[PDB]
């Protein structure tokens, strides 16, 4: 996209119809927390859910946030083509102004 930041945009983890279970979602945060800390420190992860069946803009992504740009730059390449569920993971940079909000598309 544009300049790198400490966030990471990822796709092909979750499905538009699997973000419903409360006792699965919170495990999936910690699952990725352990894995991505191998390259730095994942500050947090951001998984917008559907609304009672309804789709939202920026659904079906995940964004991850690090505690330095320079660690995220290692992860983003180093974990291109990992499997953060069962599928592939493609990676991308994102912008953090949108990250801290729900400004997803």
From Swiss-Prot:
It is found in: Nucleus. It comes from the Eukaryota. Residues 15-96 form the RRM domain. Interacts with U2AF1L4. Heterodimer with U2AF1. Binds unphosphorylated SF1. Interacts with SCAF11 and SNW1. Interacts with ZRSR2/U2AF1-RS2. Interacts with RBM17. Interacts with PRPF19; the interaction is direct. Interacts with POLR2A (via the C-terminal domain); Interacts with PRPF19; the interaction is direct. Interacts with POLR2A (via the C-terminal domain); recruits PRPF19 and the Prp19 complex to the pre-mRNA. Interacts with KHDC4 (Isoform 2). Interacts with ZRSR2. Interacts with the SF3B complex composed of SF3B1, SF3B2, SF3B3, SF3B4, SF3B5, SF3B6 and PHF5A. Plays a role in pre-mRNA splicing and 3'-end processing. By recruiting PRPF19 and the PRP19C/Prp19 complex/NTC/Nineteen complex to the RNA polymerase II C-terminal domain (CTD), and thereby pre-mRNA, may couple transcription to splicing. Required for the export of mRNA out of the nucleus, even if the mRNA is encoded by an intron-less gene. Positively regulates pre-mRNA 3'-end processing by recruiting the CFIm complex to cleavage and polyadenylation signals. Belongs to the splicing factor SR family. This is Splicing factor U2AF 65 kDa subunit. The chain holds residues 371 to 475 of 475 of the full protein.
């Amino acid at each position: 996209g544009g300049h790198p930041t400490e966030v990471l945009c990822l796709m092909n983890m979750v499905l538009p119809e699997e973000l419903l279970d409360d006792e699965e979602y919170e495990e999936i945060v910690e699952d990725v927390r352990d894995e991505c800390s191998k390259y730095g420190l994942v500050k947090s992860i951001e998984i917008p859910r559907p609304v009672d069946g309804v789709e939202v803009p920026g659904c079906g992504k995940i964004f991850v946030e690090f505690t330095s740009v320079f660690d995220c730059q290692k992860a983003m390449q180093g974990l291109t083509g990992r499997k953060f569920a069962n599928r592939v993971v493609v990676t991308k940079y994102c912008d953090p102004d949108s990250y801290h909000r729900r400004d997803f598309w």
